[PDB]
RNA sequence: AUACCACACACAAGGGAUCGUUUGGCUCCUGGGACGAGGAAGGGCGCAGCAGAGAGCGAUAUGUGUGGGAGCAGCAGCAAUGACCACACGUCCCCGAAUACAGCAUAGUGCUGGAGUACUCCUUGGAAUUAAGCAUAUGAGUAAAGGAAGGAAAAGAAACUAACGAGGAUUCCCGUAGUAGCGGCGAGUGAACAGGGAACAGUCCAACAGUGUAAUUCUCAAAUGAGAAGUUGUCAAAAGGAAGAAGAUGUGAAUCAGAAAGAAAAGCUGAACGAUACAGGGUGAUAGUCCCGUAGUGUCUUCUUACAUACGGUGAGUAGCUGUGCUCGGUAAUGCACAGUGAAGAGGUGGCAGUGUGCAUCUAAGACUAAAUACAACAGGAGACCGAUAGCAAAGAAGUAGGUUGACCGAAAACAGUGAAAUUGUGUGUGGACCCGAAUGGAUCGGGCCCGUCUUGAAACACGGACCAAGGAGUGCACAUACACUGCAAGUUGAGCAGAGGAAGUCUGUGAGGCGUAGUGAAGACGGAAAGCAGUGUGAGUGCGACCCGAUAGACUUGUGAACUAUA
RNA sequence: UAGGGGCGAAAGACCAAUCGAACAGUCUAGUUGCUGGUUCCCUCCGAAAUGUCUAUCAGGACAGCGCGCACGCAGAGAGAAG
């Protein structure tokens, strides 16, 4: 529901706000933070975050996410590239497709499922799978690399 | 994670452009030539008139002796640069020649 | 509706204008209606009541009575006019005073700067008019 | 701290940090506009902005689009016909720190001043154009679309030759 | 129970709750950012016909000029020979930087000092607190203390990024990012380039000035002379303008009558009339036409702004190095200092120490710069804010009455409305602490220990509570999350910002980024299942005062005290 | 002669009814695993005072026992017979 009415209003007239009449409402019982946890808390980190206590791997002091940045597509999802209208066209007629990840800003080719339709297509690419160059080349396609 | 997938090889592909090549500008006119003149003229006159200090006295003794490794050492030391010290030995040995 | 946002549509500041007025504001407030004959005599519609001149209430205790401007009260904004009055326990009588604005004037008191009073103003809308 | 989460890390610690709001957002956006409009009537027939060449993104991510850069360079300008203190007059900005490297980067710089220079009109005093009912232009000045393209289509003989 | 004690009801006392009202507060936005040796800011003392406080003003203590025009609030007297108001000017006692002074410059005249300091720049520099203890670390380069300037201040045109097919001053917004990293690798900390925008602007000095004559600046004279500065080096050109903006002020439509009733009609009833004006305020109850305005229209006054000469490639106790201390995300040194040592004319840099060598990009050790950005006093406009125990401490003579030896500390009180409860007197009734169940004409019968709270366990010889009114305690933001509801869906989105529009609303563009569309490893490298994104809300975790109240303590000041008491 | 300082024929005495570390004001709403309080009605369901680890023993966390929403569904705190 878009609106609702909250529990603290239920609690008027009941002595202690549902926090018990023992164990109270103190300020810190169990100290601040995320602190404790490698003595009264070791049971929580041991559960449910076992490697948080560690270091590990190799260090550069400075990384560029723009030289590093990539994005991959699957041998399947080729012919989806293209809008419906498009796809339907190429489908019936003689011609060849000639489709460019780089303008959908896909810069690797993976060798998953099998392609759409079993006709020839020419797709350009930074980087092909092994398994996506033996499935193109298998319907007399073309693979062609470029920066 | 959209990090890490191409390898080092294809990363390292580039575009066919065409270039330019630069414009050299090794001519050097004769007003420049008399400016460049006077300023090396007037280094000489310090150098007769002051003489060496210190360091370099003591570092040209060492020449005489065929003392070089000593001289390296010695002048590292006194300049910090091993690239200063490279340069200063050459312009004593030359002036002692 | 007002498109004008220098001035002010507040509650608070149109009344606090109202009660602290004086010089010229504060006789903007003791201004009347002339009756119909007197605005063919003259071009105005309404002036400022003076000691004098001959008004008829047309509104509350007293409507109907007609009679000549005794006094003018600035601070507490009343007028007395000649013979509307109350009588206390002793007999004795208190002028009653009466709002500007229920008030009509029916004859004019021309004493003293008056007319050139009048004139100032019949000038300063002809100047506009006529353009 | 209790059950599952992901651990906490929120940086409220310090006593010292103040708070930024923008109660002031839709006031000073009015202002803007305000004076865009005062600053087009002290030069009518000019538009407000000036000029500006086309460069190539930075790094691999962007290559392959075009955007807007600061200053046309000496070379641009003198291989266009034109000599840098008239380039001024006429309201075309000048970069000398930029450098060229390619003949693709020139050639298209240099078909820019041509375009422009070709679509602009000269008065002798400002009444003339005011007279003549002149309606100043608004916004950047050629600027840039960079659309996605469309498919092409080609014959199975070719596809041994050329390679898309 | 004649008269005491209790309860109920009517009347009179006693108190100031409640409801109705408000020339005050608070918050956001826009303008403004105006002091002083020509004596400021702040303190004291005087001035009225009757005058204490407060307001206003200086021995001229209501004077002059301009524009207006009717009274001066009480009593006595004044006033078209100008009552009163508004704009400017003249006069302006004593103390105070307080100066007949101190330091300093010029041929000479002079300048500085004190006040203010929210915002900006430069120094100096804590502790409480968090780590469930504590010493490195955190809070934090924050508080406190000092110096300085303006309406803004600082910064600013690469000894700059980057490795692309590259870009191109500074500042600000969206973002990269709670990331790369720093860290008893604990707690916790933490930037930069890109990509999308706002606003845009570049220039000076030294190196390096006519030698057929210092051509240069200043003073007095004079109509063409004397003298000072300067060869340890002076001297490198334009008037000019209409635009733009803010205020002040003039004008400005259209209604009368009535039964009943009231202190009073503007209500109610009938008949009219205005509108480019039905924003809002005042009138004896709720008014378009009774009064002041409003929509629409006129005038006037201030302020802001604009054309000329000559040049380059060497700016030293500097850059750097060794030791040392602080600092930063900066990690085998990010920046800043001190002492030793100390360059080259060619040098600096390319986030990991060293040596060599190509390649790319820049030019330090001298200076100036608009716009886009920040925020007190004072002025103006708004509000799903508060309504006299609230809202500023302060709706009246509030930083006041009053108080400290001193530094410093600090109230109450609205309407001549309404008039609750506690509590008191008188009258009339019913009972002997009172509640629940059941009744009589009438004696009474049966059941019940004092509530709240910690606790195995309270009627307790456990603690809090004499009585009444009013106030009085799980809230706001950020970040992940599970559920319910909504739109679209291999996609999704109100980023900032532009265009339209009598406008803090709404509508439309341009256009990043983020997360998703498949995972595995420290990595080189490899690749093969699973609907998401953005909101409206609820439960719940963590950090900030964090449900409300409460220590003994620690630190910091260019703050105060030997009137009591100790000793010379 | 003034506060981590004074002054003392010495008692930790005295320094403005305050001294085994003065007063004023600020940081500061310092911190609290400890004590006190925490404001309307009815309907339905309904516990635990035990185990492991803890500078842990007046506190925590993990598990066990409640409730809400519930995809789904042959099971059972009892007997026989081997």
Partial sequence: ?147 | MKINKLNNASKALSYPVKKLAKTEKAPLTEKQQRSKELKKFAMSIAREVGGLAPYELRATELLRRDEDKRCKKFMKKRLGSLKMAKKKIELLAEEMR | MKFNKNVTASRRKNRKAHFTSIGLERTKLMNAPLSKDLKEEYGIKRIAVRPGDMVKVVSGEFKKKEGVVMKVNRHDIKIEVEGCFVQKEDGKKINKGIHPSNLRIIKLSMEKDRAEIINKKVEAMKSEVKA | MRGNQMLPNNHFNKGSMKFKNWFNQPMRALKRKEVREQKSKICYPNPLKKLRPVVRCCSMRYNKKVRLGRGFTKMEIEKAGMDIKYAISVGIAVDLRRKNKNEEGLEENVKRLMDYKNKLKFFTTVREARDNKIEQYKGEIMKPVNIIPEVKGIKVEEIATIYG
């Fill in chain 1, 1 to 147: 529901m878009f609106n609702k009415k909250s529990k603290s209003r239920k609690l008027r007239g009941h002595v202690s706000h549902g926090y018990g009449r023992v164990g109270k409402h103190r300020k810190h019982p169990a100290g601040r933070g995320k602190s404790g946890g490698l003595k009264h808390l070791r049971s929580l980190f041991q559960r449910y975050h076992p490697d948080h206590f560690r270091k590990l791997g190799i260090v550069m002091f400075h990384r560029n996410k723009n030289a590093d940045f990539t994005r991959t597509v699957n041998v399947s999802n080729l012919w989806g590239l293209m809008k419906l209208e498009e796809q339907m066209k190429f489908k019936s007629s003689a011609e060849v497709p000639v489709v460019d990840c780089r303008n959908y800003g896909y810069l690797k080719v993976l060798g998953g499922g099998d392609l759409s339709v079993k006709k020839p297509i020419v797709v350009i690419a930074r980087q092909f799978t092994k398994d996506a160059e033996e499935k193109i080349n298998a319907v007399g396609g073309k693979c062609v690399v470029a920066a």
